[PDB]
């Protein structure tokens, strides 16, 4: 379901978002471990995807999108 | 000088018009507002001094704080006061408005309306009798009579 138009965007916003360091960011970097974000930083990120792809993500779902890939995977699973 | 004299009598002229038309804002808070209604009642008939209640703060000259000012109502009192065109005067009426009164130590009461707006005349009492408020209102006209705006402009 278009799996690299997604990759360009799901990582586009993560570049704009602050507390993520763009250079260290990798399409398979764990949000909590590698980058070192907080549970409330992830909530901010997931909402960012809502800005683009424009479709709500239930909290149950969003509490697993721990690195940029699953996002990409999740939306492809739209 | 002649001009300084003319400015003095022009000062009396504009004061007189403001003394003779004080339009208080229809606005009372608690039991002190009941005695403010009695001053409007026939016996005292504040209307005979040129005192007319107007609902809108734009059309009002005077804000009489007639009752307790709580913290919840404090921002709203300031807002209607800001919207009063200038010149504008505040009469603080009653212990509650004067300094908190019976509720001075309450967690929810502003300890005096003069923390929120500038006050011209303080009227003591809980409540002040309608005459006491009337004396205070007429003491505000004498304060306006002593106004010297035009003369001070001349000496600038």
């Amino acid at each position: 379901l278009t799996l690299d138009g997604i990759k360009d965007r799901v990582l586009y916003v993560l570049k704009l978002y602050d507390k993520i360091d763009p250079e260290k960011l990798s399409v398979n970097s764990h949000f909590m471990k590698d980058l070192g974000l907080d549970s409330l930083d992830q909530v901010e990120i997931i909402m960012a995807m809502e800005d683009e792809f424009g479709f709500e993500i239930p909290d149950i779902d969003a509490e697993k999108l721990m690195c940029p890939q699953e996002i990409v995977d999740y939306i492809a699973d739209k | 000088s002649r001009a300084e004299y003319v400015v003095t009598k022009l000062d009396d002229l504009i004061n007189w018009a403001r003394r003779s038309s004080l339009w208080p804002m229809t606005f009372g808070l608690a039991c002190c507002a009941v005695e403010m209604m009695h001053m409007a009642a026939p016996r005292y008939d504040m209307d005979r001094f040129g005192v007319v209640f107007r609902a809108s703060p734009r059309q009002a000259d005077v804000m009489i704080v007639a009752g307790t000012l709580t913290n919840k109502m404090a921002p709203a009192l300031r807002k209607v006061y800001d919207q009063m065109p200038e010149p504008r005067y505040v009469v603080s009426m009653g212990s509650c408005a004067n300094g908190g009164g019976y509720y001075h130590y309450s967690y929810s009461v502003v300890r005096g309306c003069d923390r929120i707006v500038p006050v011209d005349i303080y009227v003591p009492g809980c409540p002040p009798t309608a005459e006491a408020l009337l004396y205070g209102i007429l003491q505000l006209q004498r304060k306006i009579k002593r106004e010297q705006k035009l003369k001070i402009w001349y000496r600038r």
Partner: protein
């Protein structure tokens, strides 16, 4: 026992005599003319207004107005710093300090009434065992600043000397009811 204010359905029959009365009531606005009459009658009544400040509203000798500190006929202060007016004041409006005087008397060095806390209840007048603190008959003492309504001892003694002639006669007219 109870009564009906707005019950009347003991229905009668509309006679031609009565129907024409209902119509004249509706077409000729008769009850609205009756109301115009009542306000016309008031126009020719004497107004209830009094000519303030040249005329004053009636008051009784009990009237609770401005405070004052009284003296004895010899000029000695009545207040003995018992602090009962302070213990009763519903508003905590009275502050008092005392010490032995130079002649050994029990007298106050401080006596304040924050007239913006006072609710003018007159309770201090009741609590005083020697009629030292009273509420005089003055009610026309509005100021132009908050600070002028914080009365210290000098101010209250001055009100006592100012108003004594009238305070003494009001107590004389009312102490037998107390």
């Amino acid at each position: 026992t109870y009564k009906y204010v707005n019950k009347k359905e003991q229905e009668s029959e509309v006679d031609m005599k009565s129907a024409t009365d209902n119509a004249a009531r509706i077409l000729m606005w008769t009850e609205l003319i009756r109301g115009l009459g009542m306000t016309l009658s008031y126009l020719f009544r004497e107004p209830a207004t009094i000519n303030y400040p040249f005329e004053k509203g009636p008051l009784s000798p009990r009237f609770r107005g401005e405070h004052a500190l009284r003296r004895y006929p010899s000029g000695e202060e009545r207040c003995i710093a018992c602090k009962l007016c302070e213990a009763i004041c519903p508003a905590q409006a009275i502050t008092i300090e005392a010490e032995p005087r130079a002649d050994g008397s029990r007298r106050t060095t401080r006596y304040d009434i924050d007239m913006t806390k006072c609710i003018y209840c007159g309770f201090c007048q009741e609590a005083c065992p020697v009629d030292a603190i009273v509420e005089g008959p003055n009610f026309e003492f509005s100021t132009e600043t908050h600070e002028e309504l914080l009365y210290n001892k000098e101010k209250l003694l001055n009100n006592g000397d100012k108003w004594e002639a009238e305070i003494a006669a009001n107590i004389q007219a009312d102490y037998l009811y107390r």
